[PDB]
Amino acid sequence: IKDCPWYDRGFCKHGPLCRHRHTRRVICVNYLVGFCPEGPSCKFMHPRFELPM
């Protein structure tokens, strides 16, 4: 099992029927604004927008 990369980007059209896990996360305000100096170690998520296939 893996975290659903669609849910991690922010929207998974399959909802509860997804085979992947839908891990609820909290977005990093600074990354949402455009830049966060904490990187990988940020306590909050940095969601990518690239679509998985």
Binding site: R9, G10, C12, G15, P16, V26, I27, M45, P47
Partner: protein
């Protein structure tokens, strides 16, 4: 289809980070606006 609208639907099964269908669409337009001007 929009099965996340249907009554009794848990929006959070579909949307992460506290997004809804309206805030998700705005965030998609923000991605597009900011990215177009970058290298």
């Amino acid at each position: 289809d929009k099965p996340w609208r249907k009554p009794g639907a848990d929006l959070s099964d579909y949307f992460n980070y506290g997004f809804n269908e309206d805030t998700w669409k705005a965030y998609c337009e923000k991605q597009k606006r900011i990215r177009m001007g970058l290298e």
